[PDB]
Amino acid sequence: DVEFDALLGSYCNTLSLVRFLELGLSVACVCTKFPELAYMNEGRVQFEV
Amino acid sequence: PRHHLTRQVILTDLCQPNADRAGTLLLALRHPADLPHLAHQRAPPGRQTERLGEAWGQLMEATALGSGRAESGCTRAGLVSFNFLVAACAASYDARDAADAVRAHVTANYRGTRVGARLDRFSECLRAMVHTHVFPHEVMRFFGGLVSWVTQDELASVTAVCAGPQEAAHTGHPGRPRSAVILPACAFVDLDAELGLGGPGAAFLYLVFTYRQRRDQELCCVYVIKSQLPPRGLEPALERLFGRLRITNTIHGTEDMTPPAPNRNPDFPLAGLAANPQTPRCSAGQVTNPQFADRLYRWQPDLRGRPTARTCTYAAFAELGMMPEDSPRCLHRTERFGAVSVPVVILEGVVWRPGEWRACA
Amino acid sequence: ADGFETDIAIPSGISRPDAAALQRCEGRVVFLPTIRRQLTLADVAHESFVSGGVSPDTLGLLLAYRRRFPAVITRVLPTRIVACPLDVGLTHAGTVNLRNTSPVDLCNGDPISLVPPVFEDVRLDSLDLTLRFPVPLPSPLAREIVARLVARGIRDLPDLNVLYYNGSRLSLLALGPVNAELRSLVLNMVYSITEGTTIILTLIPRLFALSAQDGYVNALLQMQSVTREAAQLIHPEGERRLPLYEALVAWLTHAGQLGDTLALAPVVRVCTFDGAAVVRSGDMAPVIRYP
Amino acid sequence: MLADGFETDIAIPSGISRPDAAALQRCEGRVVFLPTIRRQLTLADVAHESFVSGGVSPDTLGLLLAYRRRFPAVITRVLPTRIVACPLDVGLTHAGTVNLRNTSPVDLCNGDPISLVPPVFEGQATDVRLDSLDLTLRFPVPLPSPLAREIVARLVARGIRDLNPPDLNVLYYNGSRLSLLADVQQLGPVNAELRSLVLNMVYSITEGTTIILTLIPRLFALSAQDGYVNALLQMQSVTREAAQLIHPEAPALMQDGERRLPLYEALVAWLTHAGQLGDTLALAPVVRVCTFDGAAVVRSGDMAPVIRYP
Hints:
This is part of a larger assembly, with one copy of chain A, one copy of chain B and two copies of chain C.
Chain A: no helix or strand
Chain B: E1 4-7, E2 10-11, E3 26-28, H1 35-42, H2 51-61, E4 79-81, H3 82-88, H4 96-108, H5 115-131, H6 136-139, E5 141-143, E6 145-150, E7 155-165, E8 181-184, E9 188-190, E10 203-209, E11 222-227, H7 235-241, H8 243-251, H9 270-275, E12 297-299, E13 316-323, E14 330-335, E15 342-347, E16 351-352, E17 358-359
Parallel strand pairs in B: 9-11
Antiparallel strand pairs in B: 1-7, 2-7, 3-4, 3-5, 6-7, 7-16, 8-15, 10-11, 10-13, 13-16, 13-17, 14-15
Chain C: E1 6-9, H1 16-23, E2 29-32, E3 38-39, H2 58-67, E4 69-76, E5 80-85, H3 89-93, E6 96-99, E7 111-112, E8 122-124, E9 129-131, H4 139-154, E10 162-165, E11 168-171, H5 176-181, H6 183-203, H7 214-224, H8 245-262, E12 268-269, E13 284-287
Parallel strand pairs in C: 1-3
Antiparallel strand pairs in C: 1-5, 2-4, 4-5, 6-13, 7-12, 8-9, 10-11
């Protein structure tokens, strides 16, 4: 008697990294990065109408 | 050093980590579905049966009138903040000026409406804890001190330190790192003064509830006691402070409970019948047969009027933690809590080790 | 990096279904005689707990667990079972997954003692041994449940099968074997309690005598104070002797023996982190011992 | 517990007779009571001289009430300048192992909880005097947990004899015979041990214990049919001649017994007082032995590893 099994191939996934600039939902955004934020307390923005 | 964090998303019904900022005590609960029939099971006879759940019902009905936080959900409140429990029992402290000062920001700095309705009701629940005889130290249990808190509407995320130093946990703000213990001055009571024992050394922090059992108003007092005694040596010290409370809980508290018809009985003749050899005996095979048990002595004890140790209960304790320095550091400052100033004891370098509870009855 | 792990080796000859049950066997409380880097598997098995003569009942495990040293199984290799002892190796690291064999779902911040499976079984034929895993239920329930199950057998000489925990019913009944298996725990209660309540009765004959309320509380408070009136209000003082003081020592040995067994010390506490608040049946709970 | 552990420096005064210096190096593992957790202390606070009461030298039975107000610590290493010790209530070391050199007539086995007992034994007392510094050191005897519960039970029952105007002295362990001393016991500390009993005695009596008193005539008949039940009565119990005379019967009906459990209230209150009493009289068994290399018996006069308990 001769009997055997075999592993015919093995398949993976490719998780494409999604840059947020590749999204054009950034056109609803003004993204600027702080070097640090958690040091900062309440900041604010002035407007003149 | 090694310290252990905890995370448990609990409601903000009776806790405000937005208010009680950093390094306050927290207390876990037993999810009160267990409560109502335990009072129906473990109460002394003759007392009121369902007073606990009816009083606890009036709390849960008055937790949220607006927006309809329902009376039952999957997520149930488990945590009670320490400054809430002090303000609950606030009518019974010795220093009335600081007592209302704790209650002042509780009614104001919390997030909600009609907070004073909760306070007079939760204390009424605590008055119903003792009479219906489910003791709060069976229900309350230590939970760690705050380091960070993620809040929203009603539910919030809580990060607490279960064991190790209160300091060494990172806050989450590198602008304001490591925190210290904040306690109201109404509860922090040393025994270095009231035993007169100075000198350097380490001290063992202790949580202490107080129970005044009576058919009238019953009380609660919570104390964080700094002492150099072990749990093997704390028992006379809690007796010497609260000795009159020990006497009244023996005398009162057993009403109504029916005595037997006096008197039962004249005392047992075991010492009298053992000396005389003429007294009738019986073998092992002769007993539990009726004829040999006819000539034997009949002895009916009655214990219905006995004030026993379950109803002689006064104050109880558990281990809280150490202060490993040569001399402990206790500062007395006042902070806002804008714009209410509260007398606050600040403790330094607390290392947490919980322990099992112990009744001093 | 100064890690410490025990290695329990399996003797060879394992059947393919017995290796899968031990693959399923996961992080649970497992006892061992002495802390050692290597160990034989026959110490782990239930046959190692025998006193005679007699395969041990519910009582004898409670005697044994104070002498044994509890460990929790880590990963299970086919050649070795790796476990870390709780009382020494855990304290430097603090890192254990523990799985409920319990019917009771666990809350956060509970202390955890452990009971033999009296509430109610991994068995191996090719190794010719059994494995009993204890039940890690919380310690306030543990003083309750043992007192419930003893009080069941007292009635054999109001329903005791009811327990609620955090909104969950329990049924302690599930009758035949358990009532007979627990019988030794019942007898050592009734011997210790009734012998006490005669000797205390013998020294003070007015306890169950006068009065029902008044003279009893009158005799209570004067006895209860710290004052130096102690022996003046207690003691009574051919004709043969009642060996009272020879029975005081022997009763304090037996009642003191039940102290270490029936305390059910809090070996384990749970600190839920990056997970659910309530740990349910069949979940891996995070475990931290007192530092 | 601290991360690096906590150690206390007991300072030695520089006035030293050199044979007493070499005598303190034999102290390598003993037990020392510290009153506080001050990191620096003196030998005067350690020795028996400051350990006396006001005007009264303490006796052997009343010495236990001085122990539970102090902190038993274990010497680790003795330098010529000072003595380094580790408290047991504080987290004991860095690693978790303290070596205890034994002063015991009793051999030790694995997983035995250790309470610690004064020198009681006749002829085997162990003290170290310092004639240069006028210091007398009493180092207590480490013992396993049942023998510590026995010797406390023997001595307390001895004092309750002398309050009323034979015999019980000798106890056995592993078949061997050993005796202990009876000089005097101060009438004050006997009263405090007496009161600590009878409070916890009476607190174990509840309404459900009325029922269990009526199960007494069942056991004396059941002990004839089973050999295991007969070995519990031990031929000397009070219940045997009480079962031959008193036939009790249960009070009925109970007040509010529809809702409640009398036997269950009895058992829970019994465990909290009577079963707790081994902790009440003597001090707590904080220490048990866990040998890291497999060995059954640690011989008398040899070191043993120590891991905390419970």
